[PDB]
Design a protein around this ligand. Sequence first.
Ligand SMILES: O=C(O)[C@@H]1CCCC[C@@H]1c1n[nH]c(=S)[nH]1
Ligand SMILES: O=C(O)[C@@H]1CCCC[C@@H]1c1n[nH]c(=S)[nH]1
Length: 358
Amino acid sequence: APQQINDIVHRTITPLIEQQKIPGMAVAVIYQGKPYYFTWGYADIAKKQPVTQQTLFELGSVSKTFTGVLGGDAIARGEIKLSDPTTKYWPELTAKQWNGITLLHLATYTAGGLPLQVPDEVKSSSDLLRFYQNWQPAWAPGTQRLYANSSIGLFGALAVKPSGLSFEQAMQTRVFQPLKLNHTWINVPPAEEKNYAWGYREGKAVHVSPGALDAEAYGVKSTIEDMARWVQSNLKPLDINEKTLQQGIQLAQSRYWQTGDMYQGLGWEMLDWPVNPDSIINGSDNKIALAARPVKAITPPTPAVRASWVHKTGATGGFGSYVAFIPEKELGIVMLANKNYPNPARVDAAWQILNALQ
Ligand SMILES: O=C(O)[C@@H]1CCCC[C@@H]1c1n[nH]c(=S)[nH]1
Ligand SMILES: O=C(O)[C@@H]1CCCC[C@@H]1c1n[nH]c(=S)[nH]1
């Protein structure tokens, strides 16, 4: 890499790893559309396995960007519409609170207070139907945003229904394969387990637990190389040869709602560039990011604005990730770690790096 990228990356990440006691880390910078990789520390402490460009990390909620793009692709295919009622795709959802709740609402966390977490007790499709039927909204549809795995998780599950494919098969065939993300998995195969990093929580080695709607909301594992490729595809969707996927990426970066200075897309969240770093850094803290906030509808939604800071934080019990890019500048970053450390520390590191290279 050029010495400039090398120096800002190392001057930013070394202190971060030290301060946050991160066991292992991988970073990709996309600069003028080209990837540069960096690795530190351990994928497995006990077995002394280093982090490499082939190490798989749990993306956690960064998975929602894939779910948003898969959904966008389904729209482009004419299989679903964001304006469709939820009940169109799940007829057994007959409780009257679901009247007026559309796939847009589910995708953008504005259904009216669907919970952050699907309860642990909810396993089967039966359990799930019962859970959503009994769910009582706090607000009317399209009035407040409350970030929720049970919202976009349901979107993902319903969005692939017309295709006839499982969510995994839909994602593999329609997103991972076309984009050559050949080391990106919802379920890590035995052949790839050698590369699967351990997560670390209070010093214990942990992997993500199975849960309802896990694949759709937080279930993707990937390498720094594939994630750089994911950023490149979202930076430059017009280079993608599959028409519906190209279109779906653009729909995921459309601005559907505004709260404060952030805009909600499908998975992705966006701010106008130039951004105020205090807004993204402080905004990434869960005191704001998980808070219930009123939303203003963008009527109709704004197509993907090139002059945007487009990003997503993501965590599991043992992992902490961040992706951010600025289409206007052919510039982006992926930060993958096997500890869940505070979001603002991630966004601060990212902004220092990208601001320096912009
Ligand atoms: O990925 C995130 O950051 C989410 C936000 C908080 C609750 C649900 C998710 C979560 N992932 N890992 C843990 S712990 N929680
Ligand atoms: O347990 C949590 O805090 C989270 C539950 C929702 C997102 C995924 C996280 C997770 N599950 N198992 C491991 S490790 N992390």
